[PDB]
Design an enzyme around this catalytic site. Structure first.
Site, PDB file in Angstrom:
ATOM      1  N   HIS A   1      19.961  27.392 -11.818  1.00 16.74           N
ATOM      2  CA  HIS A   1      20.646  28.352 -11.934  1.00 16.74           C
ATOM      3  C   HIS A   1      19.837  29.805 -12.204  1.00 16.74           C
ATOM      4  O   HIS A   1      18.278  30.100 -12.728  1.00 16.74           O
ATOM      5  CB  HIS A   1      21.224  28.220 -13.711  1.00 16.74           C
ATOM      6  CG  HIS A   1      21.969  27.113 -14.238  1.00 16.74           C
ATOM      7  ND1 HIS A   1      23.058  26.879 -12.937  1.00 16.74           N
ATOM      8  CD2 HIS A   1      21.545  26.123 -14.250  1.00 16.74           C
ATOM      9  CE1 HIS A   1      23.605  25.443 -13.346  1.00 16.74           C
ATOM     10  NE2 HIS A   1      22.723  25.065 -13.927  1.00 16.74           N
TER      11      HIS A   1
ATOM     12  N   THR B   1      -4.201  -5.552   0.300  1.00 15.19           N
ATOM     13  CA  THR B   1      -2.924  -4.385   0.378  1.00 15.19           C
ATOM     14  C   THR B   1      -4.106  -3.526   1.608  1.00 15.19           C
ATOM     15  O   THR B   1      -3.593  -2.605   2.451  1.00 15.19           O
ATOM     16  CB  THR B   1      -2.813  -3.797  -0.506  1.00 15.19           C
ATOM     17  OG1 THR B   1      -4.232  -3.322  -1.194  1.00 15.19           O
ATOM     18  CG2 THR B   1      -2.668  -4.569  -1.351  1.00 15.19           C
TER      19      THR B   1
ATOM     20  N   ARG C   1      29.510  34.153  -8.091  1.00 15.92           N
ATOM     21  CA  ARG C   1      28.183  33.541  -8.816  1.00 15.92           C
ATOM     22  C   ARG C   1      27.335  33.294  -7.546  1.00 15.92           C
ATOM     23  O   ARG C   1      27.465  33.387  -6.222  1.00 15.92           O
ATOM     24  CB  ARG C   1      27.981  32.417 -10.043  1.00 15.92           C
ATOM     25  CG  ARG C   1      28.895  31.070  -9.080  1.00 15.92           C
ATOM     26  CD  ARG C   1      28.569  30.010 -10.007  1.00 15.92           C
ATOM     27  NE  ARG C   1      28.651  28.125  -9.190  1.00 15.92           N
ATOM     28  CZ  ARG C   1      28.766  27.563  -9.586  1.00 15.92           C
ATOM     29  NH1 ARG C   1      28.470  27.349 -11.073  1.00 15.92           N
ATOM     30  NH2 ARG C   1      28.863  26.387  -9.129  1.00 15.92           N
TER      31      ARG C   1
ATOM     32  N   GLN D   1      30.788  20.217  -6.253  1.00 16.00           N
ATOM     33  CA  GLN D   1      31.499  18.898  -6.082  1.00 16.00           C
ATOM     34  C   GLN D   1      31.880  19.097  -4.498  1.00 16.00           C
ATOM     35  O   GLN D   1      32.063  18.351  -3.550  1.00 16.00           O
ATOM     36  CB  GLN D   1      32.180  18.282  -6.947  1.00 16.00           C
ATOM     37  CG  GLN D   1      31.869  18.181  -8.553  1.00 16.00           C
ATOM     38  CD  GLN D   1      31.105  19.177  -9.736  1.00 16.00           C
ATOM     39  OE1 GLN D   1      30.655  19.989  -9.187  1.00 16.00           O
ATOM     40  NE2 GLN D   1      30.623  18.680 -11.048  1.00 16.00           N
TER      41      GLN D   1
ATOM     42  N   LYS E   1       0.641  -1.262   0.451  1.00 14.59           N
ATOM     43  CA  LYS E   1       0.457   0.020   0.025  1.00 14.59           C
ATOM     44  C   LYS E   1       1.054   1.163  -0.091  1.00 14.59           C
ATOM     45  O   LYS E   1       1.817   1.358   0.684  1.00 14.59           O
ATOM     46  CB  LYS E   1      -0.969  -0.345   1.411  1.00 14.59           C
ATOM     47  CG  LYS E   1      -2.272   0.913   1.279  1.00 14.59           C
ATOM     48  CD  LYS E   1      -2.990   0.115   0.155  1.00 14.59           C
ATOM     49  CE  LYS E   1      -4.589   0.514   0.207  1.00 14.59           C
ATOM     50  NZ  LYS E   1      -5.373  -0.583  -0.811  1.00 14.59           N
TER      51      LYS E   1
END
Ligand SMILES: Nc1c([N+](=O)[O-])[nH]c(=O)[nH]c1=O
Ligand SMILES: Nc1c([N+](=O)[O-])[nH]c(=O)[nH]c1=O
Ligand SMILES: Nc1c([N+](=O)[O-])[nH]c(=O)[nH]c1=O
Ligand SMILES: Nc1c([N+](=O)[O-])[nH]c(=O)[nH]c1=O
EC number: 1.7.3.3
Lengths: 295, 295, 295, 295
Positions: free
Chosen positions: C256, C57, C176, C228, C10
């Protein structure tokens, strides 16, 4: 302070109904989402905690299922008029009912070229809607619509000759992609009551079909000068084909597909007459509206 | 600590491409959303801030458009294999590329019974997808799928004979509504490289069509004993019809439609053989999965 | 053909629980969405229409409510372990249970600077999740996570020194915007069973809090060389602070925000050091992943 | 046929702006989504394909960025009034501008108990909105609102004494959960133009804060007789605290949480005074609205 306006009710009531043909074995299903809001002499529930004037929203939900059990649910213009009329006739102090219905597609499957008796497919998220306002002493006002009809043409759309000033960077074009999601609404002449709505029942499905057909054909065939010009042609035709419609309203986004300059990469040509790969833009979008009536 | 796994790239890259037949004037459009993730000798970008090993995600985006300009985008199994192969061949230190493509429907419009040369409609939100994993020295693994295919049958579904214990309230039934959104995936035999994928190009569209046809016919015609039993019949047939498929996986929600007891209201009969109006349930839902392979 | 894998259960089971302190009058609420899938000796339900092996279920849904009535629902790692263990102990032929819980925020309101006893606010759509796999004879595997944590920094993010070739158009930058939605998962050492999970109960909430705190502080304070590099610093710290964690996985989109050149309009300066107004991009987005473990 | 109404423009224009304090190093960010629709002497673009009267929607988009570069973007009531006024003053044939702004939350992070100079978190999806209608010769009409404020109280809500008839199944209650998403709008007295809007600038943020505070405190402290009664108390207070507001409108869903009878299972008690575990209902929902003005 005073209550200037008030309405209350139940939203998002999902309803399914099946019809079973005893003779042929064929079954037909209808699925809709319904919203009902009431108005009337209810201000004291807000100002004085007087719940005696309140038809509980749970009871409104029950009434929607009971009404669907006892009446046809199609065309939705009729079902909405029955449901709204019920509230103003049953409750002395309720003077207006506002009913919105969204109809979901369950299209009969074709298996081996033959229509199947009890199996259906959701073909797109396009909806058929109604808004029905039933007002005591003022009859029944119905707005019918289609929405979520998403289309694209890859050529035969133009846009040039617009105003150019110091805020303008857009280049004129004689060949662009045009894509939109169509929202079209037709407003019926006021009806005096349920008897008059019943008298026009066949016109509801026929007018929906006409509106859809005119929309698709005009979009496909018009060498479009602008979204404005194409949508006006659609509205004109619908008004000409059904005298009981007073106005037609269209609301159309312009969903942009941008050229991608690839010339920086080995002189690849992908703009103007060489454009093959484009970038669909999720936002922003143009939004163009118009309401057309009789002169 | 050490980097155990790493992958990076660009997601949600929307791409449209048009093909224009010079002779006939007929135009055909393709629209997809692409995701590409790379793996390889890139751990130092994470551990030492050495960006020299990073192909910028912006460059991956550029590469997707350039590749679509220079190659066919259909069938998606081929386009995905071309795109993934590009990255492992171009960059010595990139050893795996993972490409996911979602294809959106743009179906040619019929106007006055004739196919229109350049106008299209989105008929439902059903998708055709591919996942392509290109791994240096290990060939090309392709999983093809269809998803978002929403169906309903109003009878000829049963569910009885299940386990009953102190946690069980569900009544056995011999006639219920069955509705689901189909997600079906077929996994191809590993391919040695691009030449081998090209050699099987015609099988991709044909197998998608077969998978869709088998799904719809089996759902419509099976007097279903359970979702489990019906989905296994689907998978069996697909495996029998295409030898280059190794496994078929189905994931199906059971979207419940509940009876509404209206007997409290003037003895109205709306359950069992008298059930006409039902309440679709948004949640919870059953979820049934299976992967079928060759014995 | 043969069944290679099968699981069913379920999904989307919404659960709310209230705790009422008898002494202080203070109430505390918990709201979650639960999914449970079972595996075991159930292949004949698929191949032979044998429903005798199926725990319906609907019964799984009942069991989730009963279990929540009889046990604490916090921390979710414990509740998920109790729920999964129930299925493998109760049913001889069920050998694995897979439990996913999503916890929704209901944060106590402060009214006039004091915490209110029974009023709550949803402060953001951030979730705390668990995935618990209980496998007969193989103990309990738990993955805990936070997701939907959306952050932005307006400076102190850089991206330069990446690979430049004929596919590259991106300019190097030393300043940025960096914005992302954080998905962080920590995987616990395998536990032998419920007794061992109970023995570590205090560590679950404390480790979630640590993971959140480390994520926010590192994002805010790192002069980021790349997504990263920043995400690796996060993962390192979490592993150092909790020895019972084996691996930490982060999945981060790079959402972005593009500069807008306005120089075409009266020489307006809005790029580089003069950039004030930016265009957030809905798509595409970078997607960066890593899994960090112990050396 | 004739054009009865027409408006067109750009929707879904995402804008971010940063302010950098030169002295302190502190940065502050604003992010909004803007929609602008224009009306005026433009009917010939629809009826005659006369694009000369059209300010291209792309130019409207450019104007939004330029205006945000040259003016403060806060409070949004001011920015919207500046933007709308621009269009009616610049273009002789444009006579009305309709500006809708949705402001997204970016709340400064606290790291180690101190506010960080340039790092932000999205704390919930609650929005602050404005609708500004600038009409030539009729001044500036502003409607301010908050929306997406989701709250729950676990007790101190009642609902009894409502109308009972043959459509009623709901039981009276003296203790229930009340949860809603708040949409509250306050409409300002008409302003003669931009000078008058500027003269009241400090009142905009202060009135938003008051509206939010009154909403939260009243919800938390009222022993609610109904949604109707509680929402009226909110509206009364806001009108009393700001004389320049003419009306306050609230639209509140009643998001139901249902008791779960578990007595079928070993006589477990989970209803009335023993209720601990509830089932949140996704649909249907009550919907209650009211507009309150001055007597
Ligand atoms: N129907 C209503 C309910 N209710 O629960 O049905 N609760 C309210 O506060 N108001 C209502 O109108
Ligand atoms: N491509 C990448 C970008 N980028 O902006 O393209 N930024 C990162 O932090 N990492 C990347 O891999
Ligand atoms: N629980 C199940 C149901 N059910 O309705 O509960 N239906 C099925 O086809 N399969 C199941 O496992
Ligand atoms: N601005 C408009 C465009 N456009 O592309 O900007 N296209 C139209 O059809 N109509 C417009 O108003």
């Amino acid at each position: 302070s005073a209550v200037k306006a008030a309405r209350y009710g139940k939203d998002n009531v999902r309803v399914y109904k099946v019809h079973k043909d005893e003779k042929t074995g064929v079954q037909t299903v209808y699925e809709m989402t319904v919203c009902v809001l009431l108005e009337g002499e209810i201000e004291t529930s807000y100002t004085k905690a007087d719940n005696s004037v309140i038809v509980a929203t749970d009871s409104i939900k029950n009434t929607i299922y009971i009404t669907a059990k006892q009446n046809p649910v199609t065309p939705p213009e009729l079902f909405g008029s029955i449901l709204g009329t019920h509230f103003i006739e049953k409750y002395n102090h309720i003077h207006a009912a506002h009913v919105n219905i969204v109809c979901h597609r369950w299209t009969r499957m074709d298996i081996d070229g033959k229509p199947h008796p009890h199996s259906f497919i959701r073909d797109s998220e396009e909806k058929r809607n109604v808004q029905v306002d039933v007002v005591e002493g003022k009859g029944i006002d119905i707005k019918s619509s289609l929405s979520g009809l998403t289309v694209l043409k890859s050529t035969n759309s133009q846009f040039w000759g617009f105003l150019r000033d110091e805020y303008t960077t857009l280049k004129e074009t004689w060949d662009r992609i045009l894509s939109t999601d169509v929202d079209a609404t037709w407003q019926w002449k006021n009806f005096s009551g349920l008897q008059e709505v019943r008298s026009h029942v066949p016109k509801f499905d026929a007018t929906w079909a006409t509106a859809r057909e005119v929309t698709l054909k005009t979009f496909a065939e018009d060498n479009s000068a602008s979204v404005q010009a194409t949508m006006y042609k659609m509205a004109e035709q619908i008004l000409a084909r059904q005298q009981l419609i007073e106005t037609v309203e269209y609301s159309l986004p312009n969903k942009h597909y941008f050229e991608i300059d690839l010339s920086w990469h080995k002189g690849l040509q992908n703009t103007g007459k060489n454009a093959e790969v484009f970038a669909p833009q999720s936002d922003p979008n143009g939004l163009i509206k118009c309401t057309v009536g009789r002169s």
